[PDB]
Structure formats: structure tokens, C-alpha cells
Amino acid sequence: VSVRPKVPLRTMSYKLAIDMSHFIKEKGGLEGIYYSARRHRILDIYLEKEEGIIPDWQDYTSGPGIRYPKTFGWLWKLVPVPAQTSQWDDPWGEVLAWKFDPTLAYTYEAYVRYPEEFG
């Protein structure tokens, strides 16, 4: 293969989050994929190395239950669906999975439901 050149860094915005949301979806990523703190970071790297996005956007509501994005415009939430425990596992012991939701574009569900997790 050929070494992919560095991409100039930029901070994720509302539109950028929208774009990246659809872009990733259209490629067949994330949807129905088991989330982990480890894979959480794999998502940070991806958008950083391939799209130059600063890794400070991917924040989720603490839980339990559905974890909503704390970046408005990011249309990917976490939804609950375990033998030996992994240190990358969810603190609520819930198995989570990425799920696309365009609704997340028109309502800041995170703030609406858990206003206390802001500050």
C-alpha cells in the first residue's frame, strides 16, 4: 500500500459531526457494533488520522441505558442489547452497541434528558 499523508487538524463542529455521521454510516461502520472503551478510542484515532478531527468530541452521557452524544450533530448513540470481565467493559455492566439516529440532529437529547451532566 501507500502511506496516507497527514491531514491538517480541525475541531469537530455541528455540521462536521453531521457530515462525519452520514459519511461513516454510508461506509458501513459502527451500526450494530459492540461498543467498548477500547473501540471508543479506535473511533477517536480514525477521525483524527483520516479526517484530521481533534479527539475531544466523543463524549457520552454516563448511563445507564441509552448513552447519548454530548456533541450535538453526532448522530451515533449507544444502546444496550458477560462470562469473564474485561477492563474495557462498561461500568454499568451493560453491553452497548452503536446505533445511528438522524433524530439526534434536531434534538440535543443529551441535555434534554440529563442536564446535570453539563458542568
Binding site: 500500500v1 502511506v3 496516507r4 461513516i24 461506509k27 458501513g28 461502520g29 459502527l30 457494533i33 473501540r39 479506535i42 473511533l43 484515532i45 480514525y46 488520522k49
Partner: peptide, 16 residues
Amino acid sequence: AYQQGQNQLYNELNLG
């Protein structure tokens, strides 16, 4: 090796 390593990681999210 570095690029191949990251691509291995991406595959877990079904990317690359």
C-alpha cells in the same frame, strides 16, 4: 506496520 496496525483496529468498527 503503523498504518497496517491502525487499519486492523479500524476493521473492528468495519472501516478501511
